[PDB]
Design a protein around this ligand. Structure first.
Ligand code: X9Y
Length: 270
């Protein structure tokens, strides 16, 4: 009584560990009904357009793919509201990449790219944009599988420093020229970001354009210059990520085409 299909009873949650603090505040690890691992976003007051998100959560619930971090439900009766998601034991892809001890083989790096590409192909098939695809917004489970996280939530951020294209928190380094110039988001801006994500993976989580500021990056990419080949990327892998950065959005591949290209390179580089 008093819960829709989207609604989780917060009394069913056991809080176990703090995972960190992001754009909407603290996120914790816990259990649901004593036995199911979950992550719990405790949505900071003022940080989210909550009513709009709650309506969208109904759509997000139905986005189900193995390589997408699942939304399990929301707790909306109380302030702060909670968002309950799939838990990922190996944490953020960016941090995971930066842990040199893993000493990833290039086949593992390509598999990470494929994991993300599968998730993104699924989202593309639902005409659903991520809008902030980057290694920091991917997660890794205890089997080393990478999944895409927090797809679509950018739409509900109430922080001008995140939303404004000249804001301090805006993902300049993952954005195509038409986003930077006209804030024109499309499937093809997710494609561009995916190419940068591939670059992050093969660079083991270096900052894209690490020697530039955001402002200098915007200027660089408007002049047609690009990231260049990470040491661990083969020429074939580099060709794939580079294909994501065509100046003309309509000349960039789809995620289906990228997936096919990644599978081909796996077959050629096994
Ligand atoms: C990390 C981490 N380390 N470890 C070990 C290895 C030490 C573990 C187990 C984790 C871990 N973390 C998660 C999370 C999670 C997701 C998002 C976030 C957080 C945590 C908090 C950190 C800040 C970003 C934070 N962004 C957000 O909440 C958000 N960003 C957005 C954007 C795009 C801005 C729209 N929307 O929500 C979810 C599911 N399983 C997890 N496992």
């Amino acid at each position: 009584l008093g819960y829709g299909s989207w609604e989780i009873d917060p009394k069913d949650l056991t809080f176990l560990k703090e995972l960190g603090t992001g754009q909407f505040g603290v996120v914790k690890y816990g259990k649901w009904r004593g036995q199911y691992d979950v992550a719990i976003k405790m949505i900071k007051e003022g940080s989210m357009s909550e009513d709009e998100f709650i309506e969208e959560a109904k759509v997000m619930m139905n986005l189900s793919h193995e390589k997408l971090v699942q939304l399990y439900g929301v707790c909306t009766k109380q302030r702060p509201i909670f968002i309950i998601t799939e838990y990922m034991a190996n944490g953020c892809l960016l941090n995971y990449l930066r842990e040199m001890r893993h000493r990833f083989q290039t086949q593992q790096l390509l598999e990470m790219c494929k994991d993300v590409c599968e998730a993104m192909e699924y989202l593309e098939s639902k005409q659903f944009l991520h809008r902030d695809l980057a290694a920091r917004n991917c997660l890794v489970n205890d089997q080393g599988v990478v999944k895409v996280s927090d797809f679509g939530l950018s739409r509900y951020v109430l922080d001008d420093e995140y939303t404004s294209s000249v804001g301090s928190k805006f993902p300049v380094r993952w954005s195509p020229p038409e986003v930077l110039m006209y804030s024109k988001f499309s499937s093809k801006s997710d494609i561009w970001a995916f190419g940068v994500l591939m670059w992050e993976i093969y660079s083991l989580g270096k900052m894209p354009y690490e020697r530039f500021t955001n402002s200098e990056t915007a200027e660089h990419i408007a002049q047609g210059l690009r990231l260049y080949r990470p040491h661990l990327a083969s020429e074939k892998v580099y060709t794939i990520m580079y294909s994501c950065w065509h100046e003309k959005a309509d000349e960039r591949p789809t995620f289906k085409i990228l997936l096919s290209n990644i599978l081909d390179v796996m077959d050629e580089e096994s």
